[PDB]
Symmetry: D4
Subunit: 180 residues, 8 copies
């Protein structure tokens, strides 16, 4: 099928992220060789989730994203049945053992304003925290509480803009921006 996107994705993200993105995609009946924009996004969203969890303290976060659907919900339940938080309706990306809340991480090519309202209206889980980033460098978190310190968040932002430049250097960014 031979997509420039697909070769760029494989040279741009580390193999562990690429393998994991393929699982979720196939597990949801999507094709990384055909749905190449979504493939690029899932990797990106995956790497952000991973840097995010790296920002905290040793035992701070439980990583929900990157597991398979059944096991992701298994840990979700174990978390709810031991802390007592309400079981979310939709799969979150993380759990903060420090603040005792679930995190939903979104990565957008539009206004951080737009995505967040979209995610807040779908959630209505109240307790679940929302933290979104954009490819231009803005972030936006519930109650203005950004969980991590500035430097951990600054790096994520830097990485997201590197991915943008690399995508645009290959004339792929325009098509990627119109994907979301």
């Amino acid at each position: 099928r031979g997509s420039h996107m697909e070769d760029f994705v494989r040279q741009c993200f580390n193999p562990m992220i690429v393998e994991l993105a393929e699982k979720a995609m196939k597990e949801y009946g999507e094709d990384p060789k055909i749905e190449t924009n979504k493939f690029a996004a899932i990797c990106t969203h995956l790497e952000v989730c991973f840097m995010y969890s790296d920002g905290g303290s040793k035992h701070r976060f439980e990583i929900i994203e990157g597991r398979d659907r059944i096991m992701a919900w298994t840990v979700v339940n174990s978390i709810c049945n031991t802390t007592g938080v309400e079981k979310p309706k939709f799969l979150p990306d993380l759990y903060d053992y420090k603040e005792n809340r679930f995190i939903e991480i979104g990565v957008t090519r539009r206004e951080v304003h737009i995505y967040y309202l979209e995610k807040a209206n779908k959630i209505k889980s109240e307790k679940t925290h929302i933290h979104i980033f954009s490819f231009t460098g803005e972030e936006m978190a519930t109650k203005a509480d950004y969980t991590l310190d500035e430097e951990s968040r600054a790096r994520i932002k830097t990485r997201l803009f590197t991915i943008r430049q690399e995508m645009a250097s290959r004339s792929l960014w325009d098509s990627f921006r119109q994907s979301e």
Copy 2:
């Protein structure tokens, strides 16, 4: 002999925990292929001990559990002969170099209330600290002093409930609960 428990134990715990559990069992004349509930427990108790020691600071804990009987007592003695704590009658699981006390870690399928009294009456070592967890998510430590911060203990609790769900998903939990 072919026990569902035994295959689940080997897929659920990491190889280092499984090897170590087998040593202790054989070293005490028990068979992991036949005593599969106890095999599952020893692994679990082993993993809890290991996460527990991971919760502290770099040099905080000496790990007694997981060594062979003779060497476990050797370090126990070295600890007593250098700090001056009373030599316990029964093998503890850890030593806290911060609070200067031995830790006994128990993992229960009953009320944290029941196990602790059972362990306190057998101990009578006074100095030795007791910290027990349950598979439903409660903990219970001497003098309400839980040694680790909440997040390290929360993770242990989460893991213990994942093991429960996985065991029950395979219809093994009922037999495991009636083992203790």
Copy 3:
């Protein structure tokens, strides 16, 4: 979902075989947590293919099985366009650079007689070689030409009978035999 088969499969085959079997299954819309007999088979068929290719000389075989559909056909075509053999209708498992032919490897719980006729009638590619094994220890190859020497084939047979005993030790063999 918790299948004894599924835990046995993961403890019985090496991780590389299990990962690869899952790809092919998901890539063909099958579930290893639900289609556990087929999961066990695909692993077995995979390990046989791998030992088989290990039997020859250094550069003897090209391994078609275990690649993804698109790439498996890519090498198939490269092989046909460089040797000149007829392009098979169905994906083979190997290519013999020594005898210059494609190999179809089957693994059966029935008479080696039955499977081979089934595979010969579906093939009709004439050139493609067929080599089947059973779980009881018989083999059966086109033109009585068994490609490998006796010892390489003897080991495959031994392994196949170990898998049978292990499956039956866990009361899984009866259900597995009725799967084919």
Copy 4:
């Protein structure tokens, strides 16, 4: 307990051999810290078995020794049920896929004459091949058929004499010789 033998055994054999010897010993209710001569022997017998299997061609031997009792018999049965050799009464050490026979490897501190008769009278399996070595450098195989070529057997002999010198250098050989 502190045995010179036990420290010498651990410095003289590689960790994989030492771990494996401990399994078999514990699995048969023997103590390597107390039965140190037998501990030294089992390691030696283990290393000989391993070099022996290394002497053949790639797929020549199946290694029975070093597995646990139940799994060693499992492969034994798979071998018998696929070749058709008679199932031995006693666990052999190897299987020769080339000559299609089981091998019993013995290592002696007495006359190769004595041990072999002892092993032949106990066996009576007829088909099972016997190949014994001594610490002084002699060997002795059924039907004068020594399976491996001279060089592979010469190395085993050399190693066995190195172990003797090292043991005697530490004044352990005399007690070891009187063990058998």
Copy 5:
């Protein structure tokens, strides 16, 4: 600069080949980000050289290609000053210790006829052997002496056609063919 070729090259060849190709290119004042066809070729020519040397016996070939200019000539000289072959004017790719000759390996997108005459007229070293391959599957060696056995050469040919299909699947083959 963002070349589809360049991303495909990095996903198609192993990292060791890509690193080595970059050295030679930079060492000769060429840019892999700009001269992407030549970048793709040098990798290909590199991988062929490496499989080629893998075809012989253990100590058969000395690999000249892939070293830096100064060190490649150093070994060339050591080879000439110890065997007595004439020192080539141009850097060869290999040395055959079996046939005692230097090998020049070429990889072409034109007729194996054309490239070979081009390489023979430039060489005039007489002793130096020439062995060329094409992307369609033909080979062509001096004195019809192809050095390796058929299977080693068949694999090279297969790989070369896989690279062609992958390049064309991405609409890169047409531009690559017009590069040579």
Copy 6:
């Protein structure tokens, strides 16, 4: 060409530093076999940059030095487009996510006074921080703000003096000092 410097450089710095220095040199049309003093310097400057970034907290610094020109500027831009700092005219060595500034690291064989003025006059980027070290042990940073704590800086200084002694032990220091 055989330079004592070049052999000393390869035995004195770790392979990762040596490889990276060669890239930058070749990427700028310099020869490490001929420009051996500059080769020694680039390694040194590289190791200082690396220890420097190791001094901070986990996510403190982004390392600009050691990347290739195009990618170094890519991250530079991502940093500027996400924080809003002015885009430097010249490539810096690091970015401090804590103090939000770019760092220029210089290593001198002259007065820390001289180099700094030279670097300040060329920079005029105002925002970019300057931190220089000498081989005799002095440092010198903008606004007397030395970013790292004393111990991290003390180690760099120690290492720089070890390199001096080693160079002089080989009678290479005099020529190296006259290089700058």
Copy 7:
């Protein structure tokens, strides 16, 4: 030569410590196969030095012990020429970048009182800090300043008593105690 000590030393300390101890011994014309008590001591003193440096913060200590004589003095000089501390007459074991002083670590089988006076009278370097430990569990540091926190020092003490028990379990302790 075959010393029980020598086999115990090799099973008791990790290979890196044993290799390093042998260097220093040979570099000073001592034989670990003959001077086995001193061999045991140098390992012990080495492991203490290593745990000690592990107690501090990331960049706290420079490790002098374990290097070869010439290189140990090279770093010593670099440290003196960059901080300005007086160059010790005798090789210390460490440097504290936090407190800016050299550390001499001694390990004794006598009264911590005796060794320290012996080391203080030989030193007279004033600035160099002295910190000694005993095999019974006492420590003793200059100005009652023990550099590390209690837990790091407690572990060293525990380890030292384990080595004592292991040595005595093998009837080697009595001869070791009379060595010092």
Copy 8:
């Protein structure tokens, strides 16, 4: 001390050869930092011995060189006490299990004629085989029996001439040639 030779030796031979050469030198009271020509030779002689043993079949040679004096003689004795060859007076470099003889490998900067007579007159062990090489490319073995096939010996010769060129490129060869 800083010898160009010593830096060249460390960049020219692999770390395992350099470590091993240092052992033998220190074990014989020689200094690689001062006796740099002998240091270069011992490495060279070591690498030749290692390639030599690599030339044979899997179990062909026992490597005597590179062990410590006591252990080298231990294997020598084990070889003699199991084959029955005469115990050499001087330590050989190898044992050929194929031809049943000890090998003395010499590497010369003079006529292969001179060295061999020197080694034959000192030996007088009759049975011990002698095989010498020169840096110009000639070899010379007892009874014109060169043990290995031409290609294995050709590579050794090539390597020896590379070392010569590298040494001379650094103006070290002249001093090295006058060392022998």
